[PDB]
C-alpha cells in the first residue's frame, strides 16, 4: 500500500537521522514544477498553522519556500504571537522573499507583534558585527534569539545558483575560503560543511544572525527544502541536526539517502 509505504519511509528517515517529524510529498509523473512547489507549500502551510499557538515566539528566515507557504497558509485568531528575523538574507532577492516582508505577511494571518532586521547581514569585520550584536538596541532581538519557540527556514546550496544569490554580499575572497573548506549549503545565512558544521570561522563571526547553536535548540525548527541541487545540504542539516521538522519531497529525501550511502 502507498500510503503505508510513505509512513515507512517516513520512519525510516526519522529513526536514522534522529529527527522528531518529518513529511515527505510524493513526486507525481504529470507535475510541473508549479503544481510540486503548491503541493510542497500546502502541507507546509497546514503543518505551519498548526504549530502556531498563543504566546509563541517564532523566527523566520528568507527565501522563496517560506515566500509560498506563506502565501497559503489560513488566518487563525491566536493571542500575543511575536515573529521574530532570523537572519537578514542577501541583497537582490525578491522583495517578496524578504525575511522583513514574510515577518510582516505572516503579522497579518496571526496578528502577531514584529521585530524587523534593520542590519546587513554579513558585516566587514568581527569588530562591526560585535558592535551591533553587543549593543543595548539589539538585546531584546538577541535575547529573543535564545528563547523561541518555533523557527520557519529554508535551506540554500553552494551550487553555482546558490553561490549567485550572494555575489554582492560575499567577496571574491570570502567564496574562495568557503570553497576551500567545503561548504555545502547555509541555514539561516551561515554556510557548512558535509556534516553541518561551519567550518569558516572569520565569516561566521561577521554575520548578524542567530547561532547554529542556538537554531538547533529550538523546541520546534521546520525546514522546507527540494530539489536535486539541495541533496547535499539537506544531507548536512539531518547529521548535524540542525533543524527538527524536515518538509521535502520523495525524489530529494531518495537521492539524500542515496548519497549518505557512499
Known sequence: ?????????????????????????????????????????????????????????????????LSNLVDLIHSKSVRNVHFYPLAGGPSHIHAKYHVNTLIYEMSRKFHGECTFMNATIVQENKLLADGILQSRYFENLKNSWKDLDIAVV?????????????????????FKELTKVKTVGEICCRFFDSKGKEVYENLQERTIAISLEDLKNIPQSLAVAYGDTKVSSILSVLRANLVNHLITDKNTILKVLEEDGD
Open 154 to 174: 529554508g535551506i540554500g546550496d553552494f551550487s553555482n545558483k546558490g553561490k549567485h544569490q550572494w555575489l554582492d554580499m560575499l567577496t571574491e575572497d570570502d
Open 1 to 65: 500500500n502507498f500510503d503505508t509505504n510513505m509512513f515507512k519511509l517516513e520512519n525510516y528517515v526519522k529513526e536514522k537521522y534522529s529527527l522528531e517529524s518529518l513529511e515527505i510529498i510524493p513526486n507525481e509523473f504529470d507535475d510541473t514544477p508549479t503544481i510540486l512547489s503548491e503541493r510542497i507549500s500546502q502541507v507546509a502551510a497546514g503543518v505551519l498553522r498548526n504549530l502556531i499557538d498563543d504566546n509563541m515566539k517564532i523566527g523566520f528566515s528568507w527565501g522563496k519556500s
